[PDB]
Amino acid sequence: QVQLVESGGGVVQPGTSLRLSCAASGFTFSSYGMHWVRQAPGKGLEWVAIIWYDGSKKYYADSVKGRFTISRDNSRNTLYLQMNSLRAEDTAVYYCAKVGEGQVGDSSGYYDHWGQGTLVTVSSASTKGPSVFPLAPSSKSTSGGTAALGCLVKDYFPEPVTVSWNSGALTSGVHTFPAVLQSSGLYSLSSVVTVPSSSLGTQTYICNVNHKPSNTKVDKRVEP
Amino acid sequence: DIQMTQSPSTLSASVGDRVTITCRASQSISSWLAWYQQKPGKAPKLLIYKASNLESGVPLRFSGSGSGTEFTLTISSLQPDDFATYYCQQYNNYWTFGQGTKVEIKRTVAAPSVFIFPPSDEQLKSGTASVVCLLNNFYPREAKVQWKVDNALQSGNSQESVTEQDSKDSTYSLSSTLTLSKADYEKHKVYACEVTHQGLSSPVTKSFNRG
Amino acid sequence: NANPNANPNAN
């Protein structure tokens, strides 16, 4: 079965260059044209480049022309994408894609197999752990109804953080929102849980926030 | 380029429904049209190529029709695995994708529960004030949040984020964060987030005075 | 002039 494994992604500063790789197996790599396709966070699919089976022809999207170079080493079953002068808007998951066989005579370029992708993040930010602030439940509340509380996980880089509540024992009613990238280059997200308004006196509520890149482990009690 | 426009961009459907997604090309692309399925965080997978040819192994409920400039993808009877985003792609001249069509689960209209949270003392002692407005478990996804500071509508100083459909009740939830400097936060008294939604008879306002 | 969508596979 066809396997395509991308590597080389990571956080890089704007204006640098970076090479991505795609290790192919389970088919005769040297007999097939290959493409790169990318997907910016939350956006659609964008074709990037194509290379012939023998490297004799290459084409590029206008958005990367003059900056990106596709190449391949057939003796090592590897496809490459050389990305120069990187820009913030090159941030994306980069996929390598095999050209599908088609029926005899067909125009070419649908993709019968895709790699899992490698994430390239173009940013000047440094590794930074979050500050974790309470979203404390309302004192107006609702007698014998429902109250909302949470944690604001602010100003961290890079993604991801994880949030649990009461060490994973509390799951129903939890919503952990997708992060947003702020003007500063740092991310921030909120995690909230709805609970019985009566249990605010009894039960203690603590969000467990982990950010592996900065080795941040926080437990924040959220009280009224 | 050859621009590919899908219609609709979002479709709410139920299991068992017949579902059709349309894809139009701004120039004629003969039969050179493919369709892909993508789920969150996963690579796309090929469904159909050459407009109508089902890719080996793809379930028979998927089919495709068309030529020239107008094409369709049809799922004859939608299954739970089929809630996803679908892309068309032309490969007639260079290679371009439609914008994607999300197939979401239909449910009854649900009003959000709205909550406002003031910035914490721990955060304020640092120079920044984040005010959070939560809209919990609503449907459909379309909702309006407006920030008013001393009844002055805000613009440009908030960000929002929304969850995927809840796996238990198929609702959405939404966060909105208003960010002001500590100084600017202290120039005003009344902080309000106003929510309009089809499940609410009238807009819901949740507000505090910092004291 | 070359067709970008010509067959890019081995024959």
Author numbering:
A (entry chain A): 1 to 52, 52A, 53 to 82, 82A, 82B, 82C, 83 to 100, 100A, ...
B (entry chain B): 1 to 94, 96 to 212
C (entry chain C): 1 to 11
Question: What's in the article?
Answer:
Even in the absence of affinity maturation, VH3-33–Vκ1-5–KCDR3:8 antibodies are moderate to strong NANP binders and potent Pf inhibitors. This critically depends on H.W52 in HCDR2. Thus, affinitymaturation to the repeat explained the strong selection for only two of the four characteristic replacementmutations in VH3-33– Vκ1-5–KCDR3:8 anti-NANP antibodies. Affinity maturation at H.V50 and H.S31 may be explained by strengthened van der Waals interactions with the repeat.
Sporozoites of the human malaria parasite Plasmodium falciparum (Pf) express a surface protein, circumsporozoite protein (PfCSP), with an immunodominant central NANP (Asn-Ala-Asn-Pro) repeat region (1–3). Antibodies against the repeat can mediate protection from Plasmodium infection in animal models. Thus, the induction of protective PfCSP NANP antibodies is a major goal in pre-erythrocytic vaccine development.
